[PDB]
Each structure stands twice: as structure tokens, then as C-alpha cells.
Amino acid sequence: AGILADADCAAAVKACEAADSFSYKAFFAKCGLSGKSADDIKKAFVFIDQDKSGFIEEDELKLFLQVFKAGARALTDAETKAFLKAGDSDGDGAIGVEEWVALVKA
Ligand SMILES: [Ca+2]
Ligand SMILES: [Ca+2]
Fold it and tell me: Between which residues do disulfide bridges form?
């Protein structure tokens, strides 16, 4: 946990410390992931894909904050729901590497 921690993304985590305060656009504006290399954006995807399915499922989405900081809170079910819906364009209920790359963007 906190394997992808840096000042910015730590600050994004801190900004949604309270339950139901998170929105992925605001997070990523603070956590400059989009600004990274396409390789470095995929690496974050595989970090989050904790079961190695090749896809990020809602259960891993839940744990998104912990990837950027240790002891972070899990996303609430409603948060996880809203973030999945935003990222899952093909509607299989999962986020693929292409859907990831889209989602990260400003
Ligand atoms: Ca997965
Ligand atoms: Ca999908």
C-alpha cells in the first residue's frame, strides 16, 4: 500500500479523506498520472489490477486510494459505482487498459 505514493497523489488522497468525497476527475487533476509516459500509465493500471485479470474490476476500484497512500480509506460503494460507470465505456462492468488510459485524462 502506498506503492505509488508521491506528494501530489498523497495530496489528492488527503483531499478526499472523508467518505463519499471522491470524484476521479478531481483526483487525477491533482494526481498528475495523465502527465506520465504511456508505459508509466499502464504500469499504474497493472498495479491496480491486483488479481492480474488484465482488467480492473469494481473490487479493485474500491481499493484505488490505497495504491497512492498507505492506510488510505476504501472507496464507498457509491463512489466505486460512479467511477466504474465513468470509465467503463464498453459496459462489461470492468476497466480495460484502453479505458484506463482514457479515464486518466483531463
Ligand atoms: Ca483485475
Ligand atoms: Ca469495460
Answer: 9-31
